[PDB]
């Protein structure tokens, strides 16, 4: 995003306008807790491709 205006509520611009789409779907890129052979396996790692 582009930042806009004062920086004070810029965190608050992020928290309120995103909260519906942020809290609903799980993020892809937290896969660090996935193990080594739990990476390449097809179960739970449809993000393989």
């Amino acid at each position: 995003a582009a930042p806009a205006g004062p920086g004070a509520d810029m965190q608050q611009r992020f928290l309120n306008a995103w909260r519906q789409r942020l809290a609903h779907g799980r993020v892809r890129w937290v896969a660090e807790c996935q193990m080594t052979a739990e990476q390449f396996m097809q179960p739970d790692n449809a993000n393989l491709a």
């Binding site: 807790c33 193990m35 739990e38 739970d44």
Partner: protein
């Protein structure tokens, strides 16, 4: 609980109880046979068409 037993097992904590693992397995054999002089009194009927 079975919801909790994801986060114990998929992450890698041993959940306090351990398993025995049963599979089936199948093997071809090559069986030798034997018999004595007369084991089967055998019979043959008349053909019909």
């Amino acid at each position: 609980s079975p919801v909790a037993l994801y986060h114990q097992l998929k992450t890698g904590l041993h959940p306090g109880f351990g398993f025995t693992v049963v599979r089936q397995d199948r093997f071809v054999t090559e069986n030798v046979l034997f018999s004595e002089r007369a084991s089967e009194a055998y019979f043959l009927g008349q053909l019909q068409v």
